[PDB]
Amino acid sequence: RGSHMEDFVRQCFNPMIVELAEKAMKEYGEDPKIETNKFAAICTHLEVCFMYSDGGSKHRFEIIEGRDRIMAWTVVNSICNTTGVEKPKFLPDLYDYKENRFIDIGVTRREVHIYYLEKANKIKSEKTHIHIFSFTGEEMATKADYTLDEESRARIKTRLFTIRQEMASRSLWDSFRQSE
Ligand SMILES: O=C(NCCOc1ccccc1)c1nc([C@@H]2CCCN2C(=O)CSc2ccccc2Cl)[nH]c(=O)c1O
Numbered sequence: 219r220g221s222h223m224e225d226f227v228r229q230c231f232n233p234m235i236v237e238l239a240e241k242a243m244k245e246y247g248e249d250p251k252i253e254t255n256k257f258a259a260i261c262t263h264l265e266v267c268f269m270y271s272d273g274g275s276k277h278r279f280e281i282i283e284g285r286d287r288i289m290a291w292t293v294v295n296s297i298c299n300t301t302g303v304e305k306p307k308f309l310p311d312l313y314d315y316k317e318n319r320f321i322d323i324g325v326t327r328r329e330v331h332i333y334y335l336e337k338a339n340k341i342k343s344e345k346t347h348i349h350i351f352s353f354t355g356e357e358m359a360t361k362a363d364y365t366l367d368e369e370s371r372a373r374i375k376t377r378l379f380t381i382r383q384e385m386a387s388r389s390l391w392d393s394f395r396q397s398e
Pocket residue numbers: 242243246248256259260263264283309310311322323324325
């Protein structure tokens with residue numbers, strides 16, 4: 219069974235993002251052909267993480283999202299055993315070598331604070347920085363420290379709203395928004 223959402227994802231995101239999202243879902247035992255909204259969300263979260271890491275200087279961020287579970291944890295352990303930073307209970311998305319902290323990036327279709335509360339209490343790791351992006355152009359980071367300059371963040375917000383328009387143009391946005 220082939221959904222309209224599945225074919226939209228493959229034409230909307232670059233193949234390296236799609237392949238990484240596919241491997242991500244399969245590693246956790248879900249199939250992109252059925253759980254299509256989830257497939258779209260993982261591609262989106264991946265692209266945002268990559269744009270985010272592109273916003274700093276050359277080698278400011280270590281990218282943890284997009285790796286297999288074991289090597290991701292391997293890099294985290296290396297980062298911790300070299301900077302003394304506390305070991306997060308859950309896999310973060312990046313490490314900021316400049317600010318010496320892990321970051322978990324969130325992309326939500328809800329209000330940015332409704333999702334922030336859940337992502338905070340769920341991680342409970344007081345050390346891991348949180349940066350939420352919404353599909354409506356709103357953002358929220360811990361301690362109002364948005365890490366990057368405004369221009370890098372604005373590019374992420376533009377892209378998120380483009381994805382929203384393209385889904386809505388294809389009548390997939392409603393099913394997507396009511397699926398989170
Ligand atoms: O790394 C993460 N999970 C580890 C990997 O998880 C799966 C779980 C099922 C399938 C594939 C990966 C992670 N997960 C969440 C949410 C809440 C915890 C589980 N989860 C979700 O399954 C929402 S779909 C999601 C999943 C990954 C990344 C981005 C998205 Cl949006 N949000 C994040 O920002 C995030 O980085």
